[PDB]
Design an enzyme around this catalytic site. Sequence first.
Site, PDB file in Angstrom:
ATOM      1  N   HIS A   1       0.808  -1.226   0.000  1.00 55.37           N
ATOM      2  CA  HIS A   1       0.000   0.000   0.000  1.00 55.37           C
ATOM      3  C   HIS A   1       0.839   1.272   0.000  1.00 55.37           C
ATOM      4  CE1 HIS A   1       0.212  -0.347   4.570  1.00 55.37           C
ATOM      5  NE2 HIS A   1       0.388   0.955   4.425  1.00 55.37           N
TER       6      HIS A   1
ATOM      7  N   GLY B   1       2.970   5.618   9.923  1.00 53.39           N
ATOM      8  CA  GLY B   1       4.271   5.504   9.294  1.00 53.39           C
ATOM      9  C   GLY B   1       5.104   4.309   9.720  1.00 53.39           C
TER      10      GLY B   1
ATOM     11  N   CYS C   1       4.381   1.151   9.080  1.00 50.88           N
ATOM     12  CA  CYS C   1       4.186  -0.002   8.216  1.00 50.88           C
ATOM     13  C   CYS C   1       5.506  -0.361   7.557  1.00 50.88           C
ATOM     14  CB  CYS C   1       3.122   0.296   7.160  1.00 50.88           C
ATOM     15  SG  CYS C   1       1.479   0.170   7.877  1.00 50.88           S
TER      16      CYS C   1
END
Lengths: 306, 306
Positions: free
Chosen positions: A41, A143, A145
Amino acid sequence: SGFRKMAFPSGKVEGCMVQVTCGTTTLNGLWLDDVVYCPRHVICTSEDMLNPNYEDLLIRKSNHNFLVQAGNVQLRVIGHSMQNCVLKLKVDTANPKTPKYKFVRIQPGQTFSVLACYNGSPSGVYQCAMRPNFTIKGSFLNGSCGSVGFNIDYDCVSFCYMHHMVLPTGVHAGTDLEGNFYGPFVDRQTAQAAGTDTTITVNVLAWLYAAVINGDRWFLNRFTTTLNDFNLVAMKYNYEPLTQDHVDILGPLSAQTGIAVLDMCASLKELLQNGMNGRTILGSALLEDEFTPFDVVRQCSGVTFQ
Amino acid sequence: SGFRKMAFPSGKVEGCMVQVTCGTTTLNGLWLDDVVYCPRHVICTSEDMLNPNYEDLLIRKSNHNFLVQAGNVQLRVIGHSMQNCVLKLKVDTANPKTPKYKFVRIQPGQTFSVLACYNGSPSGVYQCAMRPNFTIKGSFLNGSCGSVGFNIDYDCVSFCYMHHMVLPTGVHAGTDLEGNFYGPFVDRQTAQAAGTDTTITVNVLAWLYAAVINGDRWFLNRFTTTLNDFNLVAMKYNYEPLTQDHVDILGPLSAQTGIAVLDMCASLKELLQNGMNGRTILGSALLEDEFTPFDVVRQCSGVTFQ
Ligand SMILES: *C(=N)[C@H](C[C@@H]1CCNC1=O)NC(=O)[C@@H]1[C@@H]2[C@H](CN1C(=O)[C@@H](NC(=O)C(F)(F)F)C(C)(C)C)C2(C)C
Ligand SMILES: *C(=N)[C@H](C[C@@H]1CCNC1=O)NC(=O)[C@@H]1[C@@H]2[C@H](CN1C(=O)[C@@H](NC(=O)C(F)(F)F)C(C)(C)C)C2(C)C
């Protein structure tokens, strides 16, 4: 002396962390040899994440659209592909700090260390368990991920988790390093909930052994029980059934302390039916289930890593 | 999302760990530039440690008696000196992995990460607090001496602790990196006990703020209190007095949540006088006092290190 939640030393993983930016979306990537792995993503705008078509979004990207930064050095991207929910960016430079590594898919109940990162930079390290409902109880902000979970065996880093999302009740969900989610979750901003969780019985028993090794012994009763009868009680209190494989894995701790696994099961049975009466075990007022039998051995025997 | 005990990433410190052997005694050393720092009792036999004369034992040693190993490479020792309870070995090679660093002496209540090592090799990392009685609640085995505690600020490692011994009740004692013990302890195998410990009040308050930031809010009452009246109650339950300096340090969390420090003090006062009635805060059944106000900010705001 003492027993603590203890993470693996993070240095081998710190040298693999990079920042990946696509458009205005930035997150963390893992740089091993000449490949950077990151959550797919990164290619989504905020509005894409409500119902993304990842294959469609990716066909509109080319190599140069991916800004990969290792510290203050940009890594040139020369190829890309999608594997399940993970993006793989081929770069023209092999990471010279790459440790010996494996990708593994861990089982519920097993533990690992998380290196929480933002903008490619490490913030902290903590120990987690894969819950029976395939969530983890982490600490993650916007942030994070692409932060990874891992175990170390001597010199080999076994990567087992990549962080993707947070669910209701604040528990976290993610994938292995082949991009396959743990549990029934999807990387879409849509209504999703974890199943009811349960207590990892083998780990509670491992932790009771750690208590005995560390001299914290009040809960030991004089009784024994059958595997069948223990599991009858365990069911009532939302504990995983104890299997013979679990009994066998507990054998090293059983041999070390002189307490048969089924004898310890009798003591745990009393603790469940009776509570701890305001007492603590290893400083804790609740029974702890995020130490595996190996975690206990590793901490009480001082296993190191090279 | 979530709140965990979280250690600093250990990689900068891992690259400084070495093994120091003298005679048949081996422990860990810290290699910064061309100096290795380690506990002075590496020069003791088992029988020396009952009543050692360190100056006498050291005058009988020369440089070559110290075997320093960085991995599989022996470092040639070209000088040595004793500074309080720490030995400094000058070696002929500067450690190329030396981070930017400082030696600091921390105050009771402050936290740090411990990198537990054996034979110069890292085993794990965990977070500790300097207790008001100048002990730490660690996890250490035989051969762990010379493991260090540290904080990181961006790129700078602040070393604050070197491990030396375990006391009755299983708590640990050690020195700063100038070899001065925290507390009244000595590096001799003789009868020694920690003073009565007390609860770090400012840290409990910081942790209650973390609870509110993370949406765990049941304990917030509708009241306020005076600093004087709170400290009257705190004394009864063996809590450190809260000072105005502590109030000021809590200001960032107070501003973030909209809860005045003295209002939170009213809620803590109720929790002490009334208990938690079987409820948990941030998953814990006891009030937690090993998170500083900075630890809370750092974890809830995602501060990273370079
Ligand atoms: C990656 N940097 C973040 C990590 C999140 C952010 C806050 N705490 C964390 O752990 N991942 C996301 O923002 C992911 C991501 C889209 C939306 N998302 C979520 O975590 C959302 N969760 C869900 O929709 C739910 F409940 F289904 F899990 C959000 C509402 C923003 C918390 C994608 C691609 C799933
Ligand atoms: C260094 N490798 C060890 C670390 C210890 C060992 C077990 N858990 C730990 O934290 N340090 C020692 O063995 C030190 C050292 C001599 C004796 N010692 C002790 O820790 C002893 N403690 C005490 O005598 C007491 F209670 F005063 F702290 C021992 C009885 C062996 C536990 C020296 C030079 C103090």
